[PDB]
Amino acid sequence: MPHHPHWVNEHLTILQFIAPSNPRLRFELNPAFDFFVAPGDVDLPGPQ
Amino acid sequence: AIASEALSLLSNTYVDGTEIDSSLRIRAIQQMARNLRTVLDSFERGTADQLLGVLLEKAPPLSLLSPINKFQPEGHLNRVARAALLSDLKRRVCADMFFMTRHAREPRLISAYLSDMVSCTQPSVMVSRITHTNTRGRQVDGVLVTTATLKRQLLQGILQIDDTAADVPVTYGEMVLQGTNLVTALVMGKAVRGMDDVANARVPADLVIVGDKLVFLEALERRVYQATRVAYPLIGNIDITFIMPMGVFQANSMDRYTRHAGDFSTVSEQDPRQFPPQGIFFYNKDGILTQLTLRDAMGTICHSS
Amino acid sequence: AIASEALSLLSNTYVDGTEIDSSLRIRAIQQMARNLRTVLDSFERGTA
Amino acid sequence: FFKQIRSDDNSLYSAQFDILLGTYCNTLNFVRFLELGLSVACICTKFP
Amino acid sequence: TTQLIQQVSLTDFFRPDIEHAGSIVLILRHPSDMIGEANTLTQAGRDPDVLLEGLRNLFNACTAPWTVGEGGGLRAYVTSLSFIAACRAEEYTDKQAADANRTAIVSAYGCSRMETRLIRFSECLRAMVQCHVFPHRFISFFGSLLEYTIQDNLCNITAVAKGPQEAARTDKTSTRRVTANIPACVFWDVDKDLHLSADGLKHVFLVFVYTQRRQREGVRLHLALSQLNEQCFGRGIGFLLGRIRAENAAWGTEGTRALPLVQLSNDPTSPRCSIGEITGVNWNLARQRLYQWTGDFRGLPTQLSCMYAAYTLIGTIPSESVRYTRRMERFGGYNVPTIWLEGVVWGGTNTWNECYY
Amino acid sequence: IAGLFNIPAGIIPTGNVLSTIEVCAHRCIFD
Amino acid sequence: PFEIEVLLPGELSPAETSALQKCEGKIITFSTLRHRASLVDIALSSYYINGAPPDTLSLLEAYRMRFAAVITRVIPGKLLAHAIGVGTPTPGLFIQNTSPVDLCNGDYICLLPPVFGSADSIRLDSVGLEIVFPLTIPQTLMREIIAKVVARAVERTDVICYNGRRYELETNLQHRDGSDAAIRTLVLNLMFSINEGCLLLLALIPTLLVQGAHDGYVNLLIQTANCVRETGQLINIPPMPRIQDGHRRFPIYETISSWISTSSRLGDTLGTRAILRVCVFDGPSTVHPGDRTAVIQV
Amino acid sequence: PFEIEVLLPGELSPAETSALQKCEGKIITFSTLRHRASLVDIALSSYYINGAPPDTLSLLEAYRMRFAAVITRVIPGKLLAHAIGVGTPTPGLFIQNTSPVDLCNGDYICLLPPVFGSADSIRLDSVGLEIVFPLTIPQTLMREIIAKVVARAVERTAAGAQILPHEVLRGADVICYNGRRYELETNLQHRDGSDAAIRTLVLNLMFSINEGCLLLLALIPTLLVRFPIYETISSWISTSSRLGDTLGTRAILRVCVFDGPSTVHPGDRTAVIQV
Amino acid sequence: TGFHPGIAFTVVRQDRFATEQLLYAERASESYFVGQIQVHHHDAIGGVNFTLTQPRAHVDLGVGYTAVCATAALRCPLTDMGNTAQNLFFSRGGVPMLHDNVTESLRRITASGGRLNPTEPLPIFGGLRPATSAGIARGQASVCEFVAMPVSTDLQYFRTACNPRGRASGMLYMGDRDADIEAIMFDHTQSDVAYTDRATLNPWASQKHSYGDRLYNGTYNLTGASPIYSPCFKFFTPAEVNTNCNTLDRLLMEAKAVASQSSTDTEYQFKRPPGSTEMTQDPCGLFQEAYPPLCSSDAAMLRTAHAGETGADEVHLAQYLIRDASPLRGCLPL
Amino acid sequence: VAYTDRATLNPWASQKHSYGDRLYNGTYNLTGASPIYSPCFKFFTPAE
Amino acid sequence: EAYPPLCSSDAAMLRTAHAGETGADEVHLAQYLIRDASPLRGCLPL
């Protein structure tokens, strides 16, 4: 775990979620989808 | 400014006589004349900007000068009278900020204020041979310089015009040192004017009668400051401070009351208006609601200072 | 020797004509005359 | 340019031209300090 | 359009009688500053007073030897370029031109106490470059000689400061104009070594090549004339002097484990020394080892012990396609090959650029 | 510093001044 | 006053002559100075090194070697221009701003190739050449650009904030002959800044870290630095040797002086040198891109 | 010829006027050139930054961006000056020696903020400002002067930082010129400007140099027989380059003496030529 | 997280408005002397630049005041009454924290949730200017300065023209000696001047070396490197003065439209640019007072449900609503 | 710009490729075959 | 920009029982009523 996850800080209010300092703001585009980042060129499930 | 080819064509000193440059020389001379005729009038115009701008640093505010001029028992006052007068000064300054905007409907407060402003200053020396006068012969007293908007607002129904033309001197009245004045300024280093001790033009200009005096009214924006790159004075700025508490909590049981029974009912069991507040609400420049919470103070309280 | 100000008072080339400087120009050309009359005689005396 | 017409073609009778319909300028009147009503606020004089 | 500089001085290094009008004249700083600089800049281990021995004998063989120490204004201020050219004539490449100028300056001068003076000056410079007291900060530059007046052993000379060369009036010679004259030994143009076109404007520089070895040091003086840029001259000179540069880098100084900082900082689990112990209460058991490094570097070539040249801009020549002329004419009672430069504008501040590479 | 000219300096006055009021009440404008 | 006359080629199209009249106060370079010259020298084709258009590192070396000239009033036939480098009086000299950054009074001007977006330059189809004009920025911005370009060079073998505005650089390093040459001149300056006195200055790190706290100013010095902050808490620095002749010598004097001359040479050999100073009489205090200012020869 | 006129203020004490008459040939440094200027640009008030009075490192940067001038003559109601700037052909340009070292012919002039002792200056208590004049030293001595002053300050920090001082030494530092010694800062006490104006100067010098023979020792470990590693390089180049432009050496005048005394002492005035 | 600690704040803001003025003058108010013009040949960029110059002299012939000025009407406001906090991270000099990650995270968290912040690279040897944003919306933003105070503080004090220092000061309370401006600015051995029943309002920003006074005083120079303007500076600087005439004359002379202390080009209200010469009238600065605008701790009690005028309740249960008492009452549309 | 305290009001129709932007931009041509007018069109086109 | 017309999430709070003007309350319990701020204020009879 090099950094901290971005899906675990759900205590933010609407103001803090909207403010430009929110790093996960750019990935909130569609209300029916979730845009995340994942290592490319791998198959799920994969190795241990 | 003068251009290089223009000066080269002018410095020929009769080394020419063709037909093409006979026009270029004429046009260069015409350009020089056109530029000089305006450079000269620039000084006549800037005289009136040097004036009207030498006086803004001498004129103090009317809201302060008028009650000081009303209260003159002996000039010097005791501490009690000074404090009583400072309270009135504060009160007057807090209220009489914008006359033409607040009392824009009522047109007699404006005339009263104008009369008070006129009868507030003191006259000066009167030595003169010819001075500005109307067609009848009455002498003028002061000048009211303003913007065209305020001029129109005053001339519509507040003030009354007395005359449209006036007589004005046309002489400068030079002076020079000669005679025994030159010899005493070289061997001693002093001089005195005189040194003889033995012991009109009809010009259109608006004139109004405010109070009991006859004053000139000027709103120069087209004769001067028109189509130039300088700004018009009398458009100054006023700075004002505002102060607001954020999270005060009245720690008492007699002031945490309500003025009616069902003031702001709520379906919840705990009324969320007994807890201490955190932010403050007010209006923006354009009437938008804004909010200043405690979190916004995180830049001055969380410092190493 | 000739001072700097006295030099500029003569290199003006008729850019003046008021009253007080006309005297400064007079005492300027007088110092040159009083000085030049001595340096010339200085050679005459220097021969001996 | 090598223009070769077969025999009495077009573009031999069209007289296209530009035309100038005149020019204009301003006047730029002047103003004196004494004609202004402000001159009754001070007593000016000359002093060389 | 031009300005002049006057100065009176003793005539033991300069003779405005024999020197041609238009030659280069240089001046010297007070010799008392040499010892104050040597005893503080001398390399460790070397003797610092050999310069004093070499300097005292110089004035011992010079007139008025009891006038050193006060600097009242009556010392040997100025000197000539041919003087140094003859003092170091045994080092220039043009063998015959060097020795001809040497004998000429010996004969035209007193010729009695002149040879001794020359050898004293020779080892004087040799000891100058022995303790890093390099003689490029003590030799300034004056313009070409224009007028002079002397009565005995003391002369008042005036020279141009900056501007066109033929804009003055010497007013006592045949013509009222003079041109720059230099001995053919010092002249050395670099563009004809570097093989580039010689057209347009060209700058003038003076260089001071240094050789540093054990009991064998040398110092020449070359007047370079090149079209190369103001700073690019340094890179150009190194290509021709690549030998002496490498010789000095190995024979300049004649009088230990690494540490993997980036390695042990890229990897964790190394002995840390957080600020909590450097606060200053027990800052010895906190830093007990933390490393050892057993490190020290005392004897290494400094940038001052590997210097081999020092140049300075003097003037330019605006006329393209210069046509400098070389010929032999009488100098006193002997003939010497001189090069004649025409139309050279003097100028430029006296700043020395040192080529240590 | 001032006072180089005589303060009274009785001569023909240039012109008469008006508004005879208490001038000692404000003397900061004066030199 | 020295000027050079550039003979424009004949048979020029009227559109190009007008575009050439737009370039009133720009800067051009010359390989050899002469009163009469040709248009081939000013053309970028003259900058070619082997057979190809030059590189940004090769351009930095051509700028030092070549002479500098300033364009002035251009007539239909001739193209007047004055010299800069050689000492020559020029009354009323002016330059047109070509950099996207603003200039003010008392700024030294440098000269670097176009590192930002595609250089605006006049192109001549009939003649077949094109002329690229160099870019002029102040000294402070100059040293920052060189620092990042050299660092990127070592990487192979960017954002700059000015006046609260960020920019980018598209450096070009398609050649290799010039890239390794900058590495040589760099390490040669670091190697000549090492004398017997580093040991003392390298032993003052702990007291520097102590002085870092309760000062509120050295911290900013410490944060920008990386080495001394890391070595301060990782190395022991054996205590001290002695001096060979300490009775008459000062060892820390050279190192504090040997570095002074080295640092001054660093800013010039790595890039270019200051060429001009801007000082306008009776003009605005800040100039905007595209406007002209009166500058003084350095 | 371009000349600047400094308006003398009214109601000035005669003592302050007489002292202004003394500083005839001294150097004034103007921010923006204009034929008419005010004393506020001359006083030290215009020199200080961030509210606090200016620093030696700040003064060095001030002398480069700011333009210099030279007073020519004072008048009981006016003050004149000439510029050493663009192209002015100033006739009869003479300056007064302000440094304790002597000057000779053919010596170029540089400038320096006062470092040796307390700077002398005229102080106008009535108006409430003072005017500080810069130091005028030759070129060859300038590079040595700076290196000696900074090296003196580091010695003081070492004697304080090290638990024991390494006192054994050669005696007292001294600058010799024309057979005259200056013997600066004899006593250890009286730390007047030790860390008062050269404090920040030593700091920036103590960091770039420390980064100098450390980066090489951390990049090529062959010399002696998570980590950026590139941003440190770019930061070192940007700093060392700026610091070098700071401690520059550019001559401003040349002492060209005709029919006069060659050597000149502190307090004398000589005619100088514009370089 | 929203937990309320035991402290309250007072925010101070400053705005500027462009107004129209009206000036009156007497007949013989000044004597004007004009000299003769001079010509100055001078080289130019391409040609020649002639310069004409003429000197003049002016003397007021007043045995009193012969000129008056009054701000009559009001034009559009220039600045904006927004909510832009002041970042104290633009300064350097104070004693920092021992651990550098602590202060790094502190600065990062302070920058998060704000508008103006120092650039991240944090350039050494610079000015630490904020990043230039894009186009502006409705005028230049104005900063707000916060001052801490005890929670249970008199709320009635903020309903009139109060003073942010907590204790009335100024040179307007004198009469016998000169060493009294210093007496009534910090001496808490005697009662306040205005409210003669207590020393001060908040004992944290009114003493000689209290927290607020140490923050900004002018003689301590804590924010010298900060390029942003500080409106609470004038209420804390002692503003020395001498005695030459009576207090009435001193007051009448102080109001002379002193120079500005801001900028009219930027959008962040930076410090006054050195060299810019524009004169603005500064009331309520020579009196050391501030006007409270229409504010309310709650938003519901701000507007009544009648499609018109706004509500004016004082306190509902524990909230409050301060009625506007500023000179700008019949302006600023709602 | 208008409210200098937040990035957007809704983060679903204001990004470069948000849902509301992808629905209609004028440069993506999603409703080209639709003959009905769309009023919200003029608010999402870059409008060069 | 766009102008919001007279709308409300509820129909009861739209009209008052006074035989005349319409109601203009803001929020009753959880609903809302936006007051009209469109240029068409003195037209479109009700």
Residue numbers in the entry:
A (entry chain R): 531 to 578
B (entry chain P): 146 to 344, 377 to 482
C (entry chain J): 146 to 193
D (entry chain P): 50 to 97
E (entry chain i): 118 to 372, 382 to 483
F (entry chain J): 19 to 49
G (entry chain g): 4 to 160, 176 to 316
H (entry chain h): 4 to 228, 267 to 316
Describing publication, verbatim:
VZV belongs to the Alphaherpesvirinae subfamily of Herpesviridae, a group of enveloped double-stranded DNA (dsDNA) viruses. The highly organized dsDNA genome is enclosed in an icosahedral capsid shell comprised by multiple viral proteins, which protects the viral genome from being exposed to the extracellular environment or detected by immune sensors in the cytosol. In the replication process, the viral capsid plays a central role in maintaining viral genome integrity and enabling virion assembly in a highly regulated manner. Similar to other herpesvirus capsids, the VZV capsid is composed mainly of four types of protein that are arranged in icosahedral symmetry with a triangulation (T) number of 16, including the major capsid protein (MCP), the small capsid protein (SCP), and the Tri1 and Tri2 proteins that make up the heterotriplex.
In this work, we present the 3.7-Å-resolution structure of the VZV A-capsid determined by cryogenic electron microscopy (cryo-EM) single-particle reconstruction. To counteract the effects of local defocus variation and conformational heterogeneity within the large capsid particle, localized reconstruction of the sub-particles was carried out to resolve better details within an asymmetric unit (ASU). This strategy improved the resolution of the ASU block to 3.7 Å, in which most regions of the capsid floor reached a local resolution of 3.5 Å and the apical regions of the capsomer spikes revealed a relatively lower resolution of 4.0–4.5 Å. Each ASU contains 16 MCPs, 15 SCPs, and 5 heterotriplexes (Ta–Te). The MCPs assemble into either pentamers (pentons) at the 5-fold vertex or hexamers (hexons) in each facet of the icosahedron. On top of each hexon, six SCPs form a cap to cover the upper crown and to bridge adjacent MCP protomers for securing the hexameric structure. By contrast, SCPs are not present in the penton capsomer of the VZV capsid. Additionally, the N-lasso is well resolved in hexon MCPs, whereas it is disordered in the pentons, resulting in loss of the lasso interactions between the pentons and adjacent P-hexons. The heterotriplex consists of one Tri1 and two Tri2 subunits that are assembled into a triangular-shaped structure. The embracing arms adopt different conformations in the two protomers, which are further crosslinked by an interchain disulfide bond.
